[PDB]
Design a protein around this ligand. Sequence first.
Ligand code: SF4
Ligand code: SF4
Ligand code: SF4
Ligand code: FCO
Ligand SMILES: [Ca+2]
Ligand SMILES: [Ca+2]
Ligand SMILES: [Ca+2]
Ligand SMILES: [Cl-]
Ligand code: NI
Ligand SMILES: [S]
Lengths: 279, 489
Amino acid sequence: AKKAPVIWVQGQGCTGCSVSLLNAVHPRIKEILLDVISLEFHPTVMASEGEMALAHMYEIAEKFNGNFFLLVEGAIPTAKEGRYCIVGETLDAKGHHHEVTMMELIRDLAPKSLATVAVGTCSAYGGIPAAEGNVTGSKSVRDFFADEKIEKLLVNVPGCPPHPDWMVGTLVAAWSHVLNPTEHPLPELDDDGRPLLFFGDNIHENCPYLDKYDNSEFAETFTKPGCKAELGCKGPSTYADCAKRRWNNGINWCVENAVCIGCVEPDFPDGKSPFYVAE
Amino acid sequence: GKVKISIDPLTRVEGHLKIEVEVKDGKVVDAKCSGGMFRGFEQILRGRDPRDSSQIVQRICGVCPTAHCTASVMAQDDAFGVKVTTNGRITRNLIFGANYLQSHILHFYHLAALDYVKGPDVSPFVPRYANADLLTDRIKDGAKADATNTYGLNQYLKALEIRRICHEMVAMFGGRMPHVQGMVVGGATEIPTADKVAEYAARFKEVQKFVIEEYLPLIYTLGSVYTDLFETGIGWKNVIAFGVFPEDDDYKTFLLKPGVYIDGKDEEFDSKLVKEYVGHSFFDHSAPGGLHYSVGETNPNPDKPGAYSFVKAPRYKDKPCEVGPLARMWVQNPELSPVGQKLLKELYGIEAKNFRDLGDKAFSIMGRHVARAEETWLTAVAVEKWLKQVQPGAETYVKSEIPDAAEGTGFTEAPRGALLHYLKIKDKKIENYQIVSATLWNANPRDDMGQRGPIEEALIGVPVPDIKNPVNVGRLVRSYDPXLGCAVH
Ligand code: SF4
Ligand code: SF4
Ligand code: SF4
Ligand code: FCO
Ligand SMILES: [Ca+2]
Ligand SMILES: [Ca+2]
Ligand SMILES: [Ca+2]
Ligand SMILES: [Cl-]
Ligand code: NI
Ligand SMILES: [S]
């Protein structure tokens, strides 16, 4: 019952990908932590801090070289020599202090990893930190890897945040592959590196309001009956299995409640805005 | 004989925090708090449809997005000139109140408790400080130590499920969580049904039972072991609150009222007196003297000489003020839970009826955790009431149109403290958007006059008898429940 080693790093993130993971069911997070993964480094929940936390991260990246998953939450800012995201401070054989940027951290750990998994639209595609108006040179993992000429297996699990089922499912599929690659091939990815398992369905094609759409029955306001298209719904241009899976253990989902804002797509948010204007 | 300790990352807070302390004669004598990550939401927002802001701003933080959503939709309601219905107001309170319960529970257990509770010997519970001064170290009776530690750890583990149930409650009328869809300018997007109110209530009763029967008893028991931690982590003793959970349609009355307490005196909260300084922050201001948020400027400059943080420095009448449950509970001074009244007597010999009866003990490491636990109970009492007030079927949404030119401000309290969003609209687009957030008030650097931020000041005097295991530094910091994504945005 060997657990998947995970180093979870945060760049320009909001911790929402982490919080969404905490909402997992079947398995729940307790079983994920004790039975499924070894969460070796995670800045939001781990016991150790500062020097001890970083020393442990680097020790795991060495001992488990080529045998841990690098999970990345948040974007990578490249402006001002990476100084818009300082992730920690290191100390030399002498006593002096050196700050570590998100760029430096990813350049360091990615080649050590077995695979990198970019969880959330920020890390996968740039997302909100990389949206129009930002001055931080905010970049996705795929773009940073391309700029750095880093060839490391990369899987994107987008969403803002992703559903825990997408993160857990992808990680379990990757680990199963490593353990027995011919019995468990890697999930097929689309052109944007995200698994068809979760991101192959078009929301609109699978939407329970499609009959209403077809009969031109559009909700005049949020609290009137009908398809949500006139309220701004981006279901037509969005690929995820939300219509089937729903959210928060099946309690609700964006389209029933309001509108889809296309949060899993590589052009989120700018290509999906304004949110409350129809596509 | 001074020794410097630098902790980066200061873990088990949200986001990117560095803490530096100088220690002499076994106590902290100076401190610096630094936020090392910037996104610039105030820049990103410019030129957008103002309605997009209530989705965009939630991505400041995935722990407290409902707070930002609330402030944003209130700013938009103000700017657009629309009044929310009774049922819209109540529905917004139910969405947001469910995350207050989630956030406080997440904080105490999953961020704070590993400074007191010994977890199992597997990552991410280890490695840890060798001399961590935990329950298992402090309690000298070994069976009692084991039993108390197990009691705390089992609650940590159970709280994982309780906080998840709180998010089911948020999703009920909010669509999903993190990052709700259900709050918009004009109210809320889904009218509560009788069935869904009942489903929220059933989950709520499970959360409420955990709060009263498990969480409150643990906090008071924990404080009775760490009585020294009611006597340090003091700080300025200045607090500010904006008002949260309006209880009437004209926003005249709140669950927790606005107010200021500075230098031992209560005063009313006057938003005109809020300003931000940037003398030690990585930002350029067009004019000296600090800027009121209505003319706030977000011009990042990581090369600014003498600066050390991406957090600006808000001051009220030029005073550093802290925020959060301690602030709100001090200002409102509500009656303590029955559990608190009882356990303060039984475990401490303290007769206390109202929050302020804690006196000096409130302004301390353990006082901050107590305030947060008591507020969780107080919020649960309110949610229980709102569940009776909400009317199935009653309209929650009122139509509006984007104005050409307008301004609006949304005031609330995030779980971590006072929050406002200021919105200025020109040519139907966001001209300026300025966020003054909760941890912003706590985790800020020195202002232009060298006055330390509240966490910086509260670190002064904290005992560090073991420089290699400076556990009280993190305990102080985490008592404030910092969110650095919120602080910097
Ligand atoms: S993808 Fe969305 S939820 Fe995840 S870190 Fe980015 S802003 Fe937060
Ligand atoms: S526009 Fe949105 S609500 Fe309407 S059918 Fe398509 S996905 Fe469903
Ligand atoms: S319904 Fe749309 S906005 Fe909601 S989670 Fe799915 S893709 Fe994202
Ligand atoms: N609570 C919360 Fe987040 C912070 N600080 C905000 O606003
Ligand atoms: Ca290279
Ligand atoms: Ca610098
Ligand atoms: Ca601001
Ligand atoms: Cl779920
Ligand atoms: Ni937050
Ligand atoms: S929140």
